[model samples]
Target: EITGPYTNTIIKLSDLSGSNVWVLYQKPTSTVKLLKNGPESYSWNLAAFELWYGKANTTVTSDYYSGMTNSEKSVEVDHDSLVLFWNEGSTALSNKVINFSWNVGGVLIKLTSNTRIDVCMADMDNFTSDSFNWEEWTHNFPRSESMNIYTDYYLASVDPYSQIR
Candidate 1:
């Protein structure tokens, strides 16, 4: 089950291609670069991503997609390849722990393996609402900027100790 703000969210990591894994936290001012070596060589490796919640006038894809090239925070992977962190607070980014309370717009989760990466994002605004009704907000609210490259294969639920692997 999804835990409260006091608990941590589980980030299940795995090497689909049996490659080395790394995670990059996209912060404001971090630019994104896509490497193109060929038609299928589009890569988001070593770059921050843009993530946001809500919308603008119901017409824009997202309210304001930001995060550039200079303010990225990276996390290393352990032998088990499991990523874990809290859903709130200003906790510093680390290899074993993470927090999303530092940015108002939320941060993009960039998952890299080998030279390629997959991305998915979530904003703390919906999870840490004043009403503390995350279940309602997570389902009722719109995440116009939420995306996942590998679908359920990479994206997991907010349940503590719950894994998609």
Candidate 2:
């Protein structure tokens, strides 16, 4: 099982007729095939993915490329997203549980919902990574900026509850 890249690595939320696609792989890989949105928008032949990249803070807990025993501190992910912090430290971006990743052909991505298919990733747990939940104050006024209009669908991931989702 691929349960180390910030916790398992599994995101697939697609609806790309107009746009909204997030795909990643690596989990109990034992050989798989059938993936086509080209030969007929539903073709075949493809395994899951795994392209854990770095840069964005860096507090990786387990394995984002076999990196365990580091971050003995909190997590990091700047370029937006990876806002989830149930409890840690170093006061900054108040962990909103937002995470994302980007890059292709060379692999590295992250999102969810709408077609809803094969589904697994522990069933997703109710889903709601977005629909507008960005908070900002001016008394102090500042930001981490992962606000998405689908900026390449959430971009950048290396730590913080993991990214690309």
Candidate 3:
């Protein structure tokens, strides 16, 4: 079965250093705008957030409580896509040292759900050289259909009425 976009909506949350940021993609305008500050950068609104991020008696000025919503209390997990809350102060994670200077600062980060699949390695192919070999070689051969198996398998745990049953 072929499916299309989800809810005609696209939003993302990222934790680039201690500044937790988020954005919403406007399909019609083809523009992305910052939605609001996430938990790490601001208050999660949830009582638990304070305890996790070292509760402080910081004053909530008149500007702070203005336009605040109840949603701010919890870390919103968008089921349509991966959403997370990570901050530089959260040593509970990788504890990975992050450094940025006047010459090096801008970086994009990605958050993935458990369903996502991919491979990881030390050598990520960063286009170092533009040169191409342009070799004229061929190793072409065709295999017989008899060598293939058109059979399908079933999951023993799945219902008998299911597909491939």
Candidate 4:
């Protein structure tokens, strides 16, 4: 599943007048789950990523949580959109990367569910000639136990389901 105090970006509505927006990134979590039929024992991990644009706002503060207040922030552009790149790590079978795009028309869409994962992947088409590219790696699986499902399952299934025929 995806959870977040997710971050967002802001852009001029005019910039997207005739162009489609796309998302290119990988998630930092897992998105897969293995469920046993009876009580529905659930287990799986996956990570997804997301990109979006929205209005900007800032509040002045006096003390930390309850100080002065300022609400002058406004929507410079009413039309904004977001793209998410989900599932950078956590999937066991595949580590394949993908890139997706969308358009903005003044609404917000949060794209992440248990079955759906988003992650930022690499892409050359999304950048201009002056853009710079950087390479980075994630330490998603830092331990062998976390990566060993088969062995863990075997040891945990001591009370395997017995048929009631």
TM-score winner, 1 or 4: 1
Residue 92 accuracy (lDDT) in model 4: 24
Question: Which pairs in model 3 have colliding backbones?
Answer: 44-72, 45-73, 46-73
TM-score of each: 0.21, 0.18, 0.17, 0.17
What C-alpha lDDT do the candidate models reach, one value each? 0.24, 0.24, 0.19, 0.21
The full ranking of all candidates by lDDT, starting with the best, is 1, 2, 4, 3
Residue 37, candidate 2: C-alpha displacement in angstroms? 25
Write the residue-wise lDDT of candidate 3 on 1-165 in tens digits.
112222422222222222211111112211111111223234433211110110122211112223344333233221111112122232221111111111111112112322221111111111322441111111111111111111111111111112211
Inter-residue clash pairs, candidate 1: 29-68, 30-67, 30-68, 30-69, 31-68, 31-69
Question: 1-165 in candidate 4: lDDT tens per residue?
Answer: 112222332222222222122222222122211110111121225332222232222211111112112221111222221222222244422222222122211111112332221122222223322552211112132111111110111111111112100
Q: Which stretches of model 1 miss by more than 4 angstroms?
A: 1-56, 61-103, 126-165
In Å, residue 48's CA in model 2 sits off its true spot by: 26
Runs of candidate 2 with Cα error greater than 4 angstroms are 1-17, 28-92, 96-123, 126-165
Each prediction's total of clashing residue pairs, residues at least 3 apart in sequence or on different chains, is: 6, 15, 3, 36
Residue-wise lDDT of candidate 1 within 1-165, one digit each (tens)? 322222212233343332222222223232222111111222233222222221212211211111223222333322111222211123221112122343222222333333333333332333444542212211111112222321111222332211211
Which regions of candidate 4 are displaced past 4 Å?
A: 1-44, 58-87, 90-165
